[PDB]
Amino acid sequence: NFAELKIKRLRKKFAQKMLRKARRKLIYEKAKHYHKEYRQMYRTEIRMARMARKAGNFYVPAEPKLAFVIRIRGINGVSPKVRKVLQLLRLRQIFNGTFVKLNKASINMLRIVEPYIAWGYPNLKSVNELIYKRGYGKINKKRIALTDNALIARSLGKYGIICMEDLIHEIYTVGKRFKEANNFLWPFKLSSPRGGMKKKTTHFVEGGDAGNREDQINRLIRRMN
Amino acid sequence: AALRPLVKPKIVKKRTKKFIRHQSDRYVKIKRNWRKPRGIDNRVRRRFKGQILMPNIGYGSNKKTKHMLPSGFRKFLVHNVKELEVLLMCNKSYCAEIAHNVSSKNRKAIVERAAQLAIRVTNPNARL
Amino acid sequence: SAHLQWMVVRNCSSFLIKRNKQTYSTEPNNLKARNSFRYNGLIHHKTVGVEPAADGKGVVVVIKRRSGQRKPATSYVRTTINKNARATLSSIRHMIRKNKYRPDLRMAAIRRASAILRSQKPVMV
Amino acid sequence: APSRNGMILKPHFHKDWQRRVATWFNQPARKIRRRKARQAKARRIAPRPASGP
Amino acid sequence: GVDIRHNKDRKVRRKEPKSQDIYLRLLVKLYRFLARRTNSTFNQVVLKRLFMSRTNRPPLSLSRMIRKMKLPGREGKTAVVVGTITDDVRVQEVPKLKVCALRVSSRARSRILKAGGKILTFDQLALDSPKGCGTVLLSGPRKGREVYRHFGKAPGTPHSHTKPYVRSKGRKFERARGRRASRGYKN
Amino acid sequence: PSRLRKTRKLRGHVSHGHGRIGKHRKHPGGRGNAGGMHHHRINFDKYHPGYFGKVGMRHYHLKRNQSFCPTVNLDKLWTLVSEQTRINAAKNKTGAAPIIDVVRSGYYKVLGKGKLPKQPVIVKAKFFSRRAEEKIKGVGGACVLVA
RNA sequence: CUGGAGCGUCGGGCCCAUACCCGGCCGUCGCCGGCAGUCGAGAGUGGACGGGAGCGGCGGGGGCGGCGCGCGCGCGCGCCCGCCCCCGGAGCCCCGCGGACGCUACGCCGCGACGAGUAGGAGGGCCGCUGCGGUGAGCCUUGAAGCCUAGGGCGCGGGCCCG
RNA sequence: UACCCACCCGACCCGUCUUGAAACACGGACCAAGGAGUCUAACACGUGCGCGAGUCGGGGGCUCGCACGAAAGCCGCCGUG
RNA sequence: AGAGGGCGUGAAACCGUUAAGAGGUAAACGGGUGGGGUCCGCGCAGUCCGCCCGGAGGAUUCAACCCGGCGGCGGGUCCGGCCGUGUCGGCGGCCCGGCGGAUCUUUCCCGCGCGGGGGACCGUCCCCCGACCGGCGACCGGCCGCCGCCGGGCGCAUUUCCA
Ligand SMILES: [Mg+2]
Ligand SMILES: [Mg+2]
Ligand SMILES: [Mg+2]
Ligand SMILES: [Mg+2]
Ligand SMILES: [Mg+2]
Ligand SMILES: [Mg+2]
Ligand SMILES: [Mg+2]
Ligand SMILES: [Mg+2]
Ligand SMILES: [Mg+2]
Ligand SMILES: [Mg+2]
Ligand SMILES: [Mg+2]
Ligand SMILES: [Mg+2]
Ligand SMILES: [Mg+2]
Ligand SMILES: [Mg+2]
Q1: To 5 degrees, how large is the angle CA B7–CA B5–CA C56?
Q2: Where are the alpha helices (DSSP H) in E38-99?
Q3: What is the dihedral of CA E13, E16, E20, E21, to 10 degrees?
Q4: What distance in Å separates the CA atoms of residue F69 and residue F89, rounded to the nearest whole number?
Q5: How far apart are CA B64 and CA D7, in angstroms?
Q6: Which sign, positive or negative, has the C-alpha torsion B20, B21, B22, B26?
Q7: Cα F1 from chain centroid (whole Å)
Q8: Closest CA to A29 of A132, A162, A154
Q9: Burial of F93 by CB count in 10 Å (0-12 exposed, 13-18 middle, 19+ buried)?
């Protein structure tokens, strides 16, 4: 009894030091595409512009699929058709931001709220800094901090998403489960832009802060993480 | 060197001052006592600037250190001897206050019972 | 039953006493004057009490019998203990536990007894 | 001024109920005033059906 | 600066019974006990009714508990009711039942027991079947109360036929400006 | 009691649950059921339809004793008489059929609601329904009149 | 105030709200919340009990892996056979044999989340006044109510408590 | 924390009617004491408790000089409604 | 008599003077400090206590053990009896068990078809004993196991007290 049990429960114990090793290993080698793709995607865009330029000839890189949108103005003196979109983008509060999947429907939702937001096609280190530093998840409908990744796996393990790095394909590459990756992900509440805006009111294009800033949103994100 | 507490935490008080009533200063017919001002125009109530502050909730006190005397022992209003033996176990977290209207002879009786069984009394040395 | 009496006696009780944000219970044998289920004397069917001995020295340990209650006179039995602090507690400990008789009070009964003892000795300088 | 679903009500207090209200704090002393008749009449007519003919 | 309506964030469900009757409060206590624990939904629902009001736990009639236990499959189960069972003077072949109720009117008591049935209470049920295994939840008709006929659109609106409240019905007591089409119109 | 009223919670509360724009003035509408045609119309017409007007025919001096006539449904005769008088019969083998004076239990008329148990009866009553007739007949047993 | 402290177009740098971030603390709502005496952390069963046998095993995917493996099954001891034994004692991070100090079972505890307000509602008021039924071996000529106090305090505060 | 005093920043007098009051609108010298949503009938919904195809309440009766009592108890009344 | 003939108490406005501090933007107010006072805690070291332990001093009887007694607790054999739940048997209370029923007999009795009474029936509630089962806080008796108190034994490397 005792020493038929003693063993029986120690097994379970070790059958775990299998398992929580195995997974730990899995994550680590997943993280290893997540280098290799993550590099190969860079070079293979340069690769090709380099290829084009050799002929008398010419890229147009893939249109961006991902554009995290920062709301930049507050919440009073706000039209309706706007305020509804801004709470479909979950940008309720002033000057938080979400990872939005560009898309004829979504792009055209941003036209209509343009004067209040600031979006751009963000870059890896942007996604990283954000998911890492300011990425809490929605678990039982709660802003809960992503400290161990038994919290990600716990919501998203049914999409082959098991760790903080597996989230981060599904957040460039869009992937199949952009939707559900970017909806345990709870809108990222970003501090005031350190060193300050240019002009909250106007299009970037005319010196302001609003709507599209291609690429240049990554200056903006450094200042607000 | 009296009856130390079980635990002496840092007591913090978000505001230490009283909550006087609007214009309790000008008029003598007004007691300092809060009466919440429901004037249409009245400046206090529309929380206006550099006016008297209004007693609101979230500007109230820490659960642990609530209700707690500077030394540590929250009062009991001990009122004869028999009521003192109630604290015999809860001696070290909170103390006896001997009621105003106990007569000098039993004001004594209670005190030396307290000291016998180590319960602080805040007015031990009072009537005499 | 116990659980029922309680609900009558929760509020509305002559040995209950609530001033000044506490509540308390002056009944004979609860240990630590609490308003409670566990630490209440009467409600229940097995009860430990600890209180000072009438002589000035020692501790009496009151144990409810449960042979036949609704029999207040005899329902409910006492014993003196004049020993030397350590054995005094070891007696209460051995009386409650290893007699499986409400091993909840267990410690409270000790803490009481211990507190009783300190109330009876050279009081002060 | 009615508001949203009741009955009509013609309570009849337009006259002067106030003056001519009888309260009944006799009721129990009356009960007894009576008792003493039932009682007395019987003891007076000794052998005779107390109730009446 | 968050831009939610705070209008009905607070939900309005009852989360203790409003009564002070120690026995309800006890068998309620008994299943805060069970309903937290055991997987069975049953005792959530029973909990959620011990809880509810008189007016909103209407009484079951015995007759209706017959035709809810006559049905195919339901033999051998316990009928369970968070409320009262009453008679049906207009029923007679009472089958042998097993019931739970908070109350059972004393005449229903004798009718059930005469048939060699059993009646349980909201504690004995908890020992019989804590998970609610082999049971049948039933309630009385909540759209029963004569009150409920007064409810709806209104009397006087088009072909929506709803009791008006009238001090005393009769010939002269609402039959005119709006019911005979001869006398103004009608609805 | 006084203690458990809103008027306690409305002190320091100036207008007193009653509005300081339009005050609580004495009798704005009128007095009682007043303005039924004019201007309180929308209640009376939408909420008490058929109030305003005559209808029907006078019966003037009228006495209910003249037209006292309670009702019973077949549904529950097998109540009126002590249930043992049914258990006796349903059995017995002679076609007894107990008699039921719906008179004696207090009803000037018997009506055909409900099932009736398969059990022959003699119902003595006053003003029978048709259906009450048919059901009793079709069960077995008879319909006797009383004055 | 004047190659300006004027006016165009522009830089850096800095200053500051009750705005955002992090933290602190006090409200409320929700969590089908946990907690009325129990194992267990992307939990991915557990247990009889038999017959047979043993170093067997379950000799499956650059999957990168998820469900099976390298802290043990069997073993150290008693000596190929037995065992693999009892918590009134394993010595305990799991303990299912009995359970907080904690469990006023309308008590307490963790999460998150949120708490501009006239009229009005609603709730909560060991907030306050006077009356009675209970109850407090309440208090009191060794001094009550009131009254008075630049006498210590407590509540967010109604007030409350103390000199 | 409170008394006086000192400084720095803030700062219009409340109440009210009012689209808008510090109002060059009105009430208001100061203080004590008194002072304004009450009772009843009738509805209605909401809820609490009893019993449940019933259930009641009187008004009557039977049981008190009441100390408590002008109470409580009980009645094919109990259903004449 | 700081109860003096409009006298218990004896507030505020208000005024009476004593002390302190201030004082050209009327006072008065909010936030923040600073100085000073009246008082209030102390300290003529506040070094705060509580375990356990080691050491060195000093002092009583024990604790560990049995044995006599007393009192609990728990266990069961339900052993024996008493108790009550569900079942069965007795048709045994049934008339020595009642009450309810418009059940039935005027085969009965009394009084005038009716009333009262008696007799038959069903539903209910009691005895006998026998059997099963919840064997239930409802005990009570023995046997047990454990605890506590009292009294005996144990004189001191023990077990207490004190510094
Ligand atoms: Mg604006
Ligand atoms: Mg008469
Ligand atoms: Mg208001
Ligand atoms: Mg007004
Ligand atoms: Mg108007
Ligand atoms: Mg608010
Ligand atoms: Mg006007
Ligand atoms: Mg002007
Ligand atoms: Mg005017
Ligand atoms: Mg005097
Ligand atoms: Mg006098
Ligand atoms: Mg005087
Ligand atoms: Mg003066
Ligand atoms: Mg001077």
Answers
A1: 135
A2: 42-50, 62-69
A3: 110
A4: 30
A5: 57
A6: negative
A7: 35
A8: A162
A9: exposed
* CA angle in degrees (0–180, nearest 5) for F72-F78-F82: 115
Q: Report whether B75 contacts B69 (CB < 8 A).
A: yes
CB-count exposure of residue F85 (10 Å: 0-12, 13-18, 19+): middle
Helix/strand/coil for A194: coil
Which amino acid is it at C26?
A: T
Cα A92 to Cα A87, A212, E1: the distances in Å are 5, 19, 8
CA of C98 to C1' of I147 (A): 7
Which bases of chain I come closer than 7 Å to a protein CB? 12-14, 27-32, 42-43, 46-49, 62-63, 71-74, 100-104, 122-124, 137-140, 146-150, 159-162
> Taking the CA atoms of chain F, what radius of gyration do you get in angstroms?
29
DSSP characters for F7-29? HHHTSS-SS-SS-SSS---S-SS
Q: Does C3 touch chain B (CB under 8 A)?
A: no
Q: Cα dihedral sign for D4, D6, D12, D17?
A: negative
Resolution (A): 3.8
Measured over the CA atoms of residue E44, residue E46, residue E50 and residue E56, the dihedral's sign is positive
Please tell me the distance between residue F99's alpha carbon and the centre of ligand 10 in angstroms.
95
Provide CB contacts within 8 A for F33, sequence distance 6+: D2, D8, D9, D10
How was this one solved? cryo-EM
Using the beta-carbon criterion (under 8 Å), do E25 and C8 form an inter-chain contact?
A: no
Question: HSE-up of F80 (CA within 13 Å, CB side)?
Answer: 22
Residue that the structure tokens 């002929």 belong to: A55
Neighbours of B123 (CB within 10 A): 14
Alpha-carbon separation of residue E93 from B50, B104, E111, E115 (angstroms): 83, 82, 10, 9
Of A209, A208, A211, A197, nearest in space to A119 by CA: A211
Q: Which two tokens stand for residue C25?
A: 């219970």
Three-state DSSP class for E32? helix
**Rounded to an integer, what distance in angstroms lies between the CA atom of residue C93 and that of residue A70?**
67
Interface of F with E in 40-69 (CB under 8 A): 44-57
DSSP state of B96: B
E18 closest CA partner among E55, E60, E58: E55
The answer to whether the Cβ–Cβ distance between A75 and E4 falls below 8 Å is: no
> Measured between alpha carbons, how far is C60 from C51 in angstroms, rounded to an integer?
6
DSSP 8-state symbol, A114: G
Angstrom distance (rounded) from CA A175 to CA A181: 9
Tokens at C9, concatenated? 């006696």
CA distance D48 to B52: 91
Look at residues B20, B18, B45 and name the one whose alpha carbon lies nearest to residue B33: B20
Burial F6-38 (b: 16+ CB within 10 A, else e): eeeeeeeeeeeeeeeeeeeeeeeeeeebebbee
